[PDB]
Amino acid sequence: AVVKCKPTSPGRRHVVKVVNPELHKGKPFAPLLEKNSKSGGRNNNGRITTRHIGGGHKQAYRIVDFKRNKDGIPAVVERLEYDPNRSANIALVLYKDGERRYILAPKGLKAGDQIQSGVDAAIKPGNTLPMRNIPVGSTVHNVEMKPGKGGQLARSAGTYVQIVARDGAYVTLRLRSGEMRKVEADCRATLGEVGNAEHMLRVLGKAGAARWRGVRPTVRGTAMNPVDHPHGGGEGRNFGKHPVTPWGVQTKGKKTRSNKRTDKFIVRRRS
Amino acid sequence: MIREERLLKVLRAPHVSEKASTAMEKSNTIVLKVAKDATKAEIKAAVQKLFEVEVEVVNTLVVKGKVKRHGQRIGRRSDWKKAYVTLKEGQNL
Amino acid sequence: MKRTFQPSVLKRNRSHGFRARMATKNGRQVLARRRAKGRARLTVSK
Amino acid sequence: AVFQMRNVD
RNA sequence: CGCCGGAAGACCAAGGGUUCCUGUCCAACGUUAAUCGGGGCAGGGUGAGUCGACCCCUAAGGCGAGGCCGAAAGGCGUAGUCGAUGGGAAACAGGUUAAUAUUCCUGUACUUGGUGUUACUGCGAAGGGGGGACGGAGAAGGCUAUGUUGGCCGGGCGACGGUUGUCCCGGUUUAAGCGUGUAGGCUGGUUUUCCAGGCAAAUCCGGAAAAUCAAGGCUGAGGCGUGAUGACGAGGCACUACGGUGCUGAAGCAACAAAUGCCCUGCUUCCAGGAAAAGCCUCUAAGCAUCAGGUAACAUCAAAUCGUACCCCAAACCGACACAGGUGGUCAGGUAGAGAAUACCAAGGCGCUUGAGAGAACUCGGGUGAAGGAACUAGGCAAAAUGGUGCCGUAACUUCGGGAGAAGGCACGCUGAUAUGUAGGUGAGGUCCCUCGCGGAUGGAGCUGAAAUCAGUCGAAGAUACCAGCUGGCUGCAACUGUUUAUUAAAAACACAGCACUGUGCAAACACGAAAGUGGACGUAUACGGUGUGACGCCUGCCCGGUGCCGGAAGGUUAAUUG
RNA sequence: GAGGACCGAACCGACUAAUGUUGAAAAAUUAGCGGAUGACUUGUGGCUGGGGGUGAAAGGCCAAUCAAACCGGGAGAUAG
């Protein structure tokens, strides 16, 4: 339930906060917390391998149970909690043995829900069961790319992946990008979709809003110099040159992809 | 500990001064130079036998040698360790 | 105006101390030249 | 101080 | 006499390295003379179980057994190790020196270990859990540092009209520790049984069933006692190298105000969701199991090594100088005031290492000026002016927050009365209730104290000093807050949220690196990179010939290769 | 009690003008100014090393020097 900010002073007028009242305010479940120091975008060489990354508020990473290895055991939600690292909300479910692990939150999730991973598990949202048991066309997220590896697919908020086919050991998936890709049926996946569909609505609303996100200001290359960027000079803005990356790779209209090994999995290019 | 021979070199020379004389007539703490190393305990044992008097408490400090110079050439002196051996009611010489 | 020289003994020994010369093969060669040249101070410290 | 500038006549 | 007094006072770290103290000296050092000095020479000075370092632990990182990789040098990195700007046990008052004091002395203490005696008893990791362990902003409340007034004690009857009184001056200071556990804050406690969890196990944590009871516990300033029969103490008695040393030494209370300090690592609230490990509290395992060990009372021993002087916004550090520059943290008095602004003062430190004159131009820093009031000038440049609080009132326009303190005015001192000090705030005695405490109600003295009305009064001027917005209109540009050529350009330039295009399915694209390995990211197309444009509103037309690129695979053309 | 909110010290920044120009100072002082709860400032300690680094982009900055730092070497380079 987004609420547009009132125009009290500049840098506040355009802001649109995305409040989430059902979230449980308070200190995070401490033992699973661990350090996540900012890299600054630099590597071991100390070179800036990736620009426009630095600064921002400190963040603490939290482990999440992608594998859902505890099959059979019933689980119950305790409370939703904010995750700085990801657009998707995370929830601290309570296993019957008393063990606790974070999990991505399905749109149908509420406090006290009886979600349960397992091969024999009933088909309700929030469950994580292998796709071989999954009916065609159901909304699916957190799909493993490899058997038991975790679930790299559809981790982002509002994402969902339909399963349009099941022929062979593989099961075809419909990615949010619209790109088609085969995946083995043995891989685990979560039913339904993550509920943070309101995430796109945020618009920051000020120049300093990106500063805590670790984002750094972008300098266009036409404003630069020929020695620093291929674009530049010309005395008074200008342009002329065909657009390019600073390292000279052609921007706009050049597929940089070159994997070959994974082309077998690519049923179709994204549209 | 003793090892009598190590103890003997600790008491290389007494260090008389106008301030030290006041320490003996009032605080009853004899003042003398000691070895560059050693410890509070070894200095105490040196007084227990050779000075044949009981020690109350030992205190130590290190005065840095003042730099000297003559022309472009310079000549730093040498460091030495002062010590404060407080004496009990049994003090003599 | 602030001077370029802003002394700190802790930074000095870490950057220009005898230990830094031994940190790499290139640094050990630096000491070798000072010795053949003859010097009162192979490095600097206290 | 020496300065710089240019003598463009 | 004059200056600072949120410092030009005081302290620590950084850094400097005897500049500290004393005697003596004046060649050179000091922008002058110099008996003086941060100068020459010599002597003296730095006292630690509990201040800090060392030590234990860890961040960003560095190094790195093997290993991976690279012509060689070398690069990366595991287990490890190092790394404070962090965390981790414990000393406070008085006195003394020419210079050092939480170090020595005096008084009262405290922590962690070794050993011994006695009592009780399941003790034991590199492991599990708990704890340590943390954000921004805001709101007050309860207190202390500290201040004012009164009381008390000691001293003073005034160089000139008054001053034995409602007068003047000074003091009224006391810590750690220990006992007490309040103002508050947090949480329902105890017991029994069971478990797919916490790599092994578990009495601990967690989960599940019951029973019982309602206050069980933790945290916590400060106050009150003790510490304190003292110590300090204005001022005297006494010797006196006139630089001081011994002895004695009165009162040592109350009320109010009160913080930026404390309770507070709290509470409330908001996204931007807020280090790491050890010490510490517990749990067992491999084990010992009458032991060793564990806990408690007493006694004893040990707490080493190193720093400790001086300078600390400067004459000593950094600036070639005894240089109008630069340098982090801590201590925060009186009056006025919103205030750490500013003026005058306390404590305290200084009059800044050339002076004495003369009173020309001209120059620099200021004051005032009759008449005019931008006529000056590239240009209202510079000066001048506006300036506070309370109240009245305030247009076009707008994204309905603005514009706006728009503009434009009134009131402002002192004294009396309302009320010999009011509204309020603080709060004693008396009275009563108490599972009886640092209680509550009742009660209202005393103290403190604005703001207002009326009347009177003085000056040319009462926000009188310092302090302290000039305002309005049209328009260009950029949305705005910011950032930018350190050392001639602060802008229309850059950034900007937003919009769009394009690349990317994860061992991603991209980037560093001959590689290995990292970053992206411990992210997953609502994500990330690149490019363009630059809030918002109205929108964003046409052209693919040329150039670039995508898509397409027959044909034309064509390399190494085959010969 | 919200704000890259308002006035305004510390703090940070350096728009105007005078003085200074072998200055007290190889960029300061004086009288005004901007920001001052944040895209803030700063202490301490690390990281990126020369055709490279870093840059809210001035080709600025990298020890008073930067359209390619400094040191040593080739080197007594070449110079019609």
Author numbering:
A (entry chain BC): 2 to 272
B (entry chain BT): 1 to 93
C (entry chain B2): 1 to 46
D (entry chain B5): -8 to 0
Please share excerpts from the published article on this structure:
However, in the presence of sub-inhibitory concentrations of ERY, ribosomes translating the ErmBL leader peptide become stalled, leading to an alternative stem–loop structure in the mRNA that exposes the RBS and start codon of the ermB gene and thus allows ribosome binding and induction of ErmB expression.
In silico sorting of cryo-EM images yielded two major homogeneous subpopulations of ribosomes bearing P-tRNA and E-tRNAs, but differing in the presence (termed ErmBL-APE-SRC; 85,393 particles, 33%) or absence (termed ErmBL-PE-SRC; 75,839 particles, 30%) of A-tRNA. Both subpopulations could be refined to an average resolution of 3.6 Å (using a Fourier shell correlation (FSC) cutoff of 0.143; Supplementary Fig. 2), with local resolution calculations indicating that the ribosomal core reaches towards 3.1 Å. Density is also observed for the lysyl moiety attached to the CCA end of the A-tRNA as well as for the ErmBL leader peptide attached to CCA end of the P-tRNA. In contrast to the previous study, the higher resolution achieved here enables us to more accurately place the CCA end of the A-tRNA and also to model the lysyl moiety, which was not visible before. Comparison of the position of the CCA end of the Lys-tRNA in ErmBL-SRC with the unaccommodated C-pmn and accommodated CC-pmn on the H. marismortui 50S subunit293031, as well as with accommodated CCA end of the Phe-tRNA in the T. thermophilus pre-attack complexes, suggests that the Lys-tRNA in the ErmBL-SRC is in a fully or near-fully accommodated state. In the ErmBL-PE-SRC, there is no clear density for U2506.
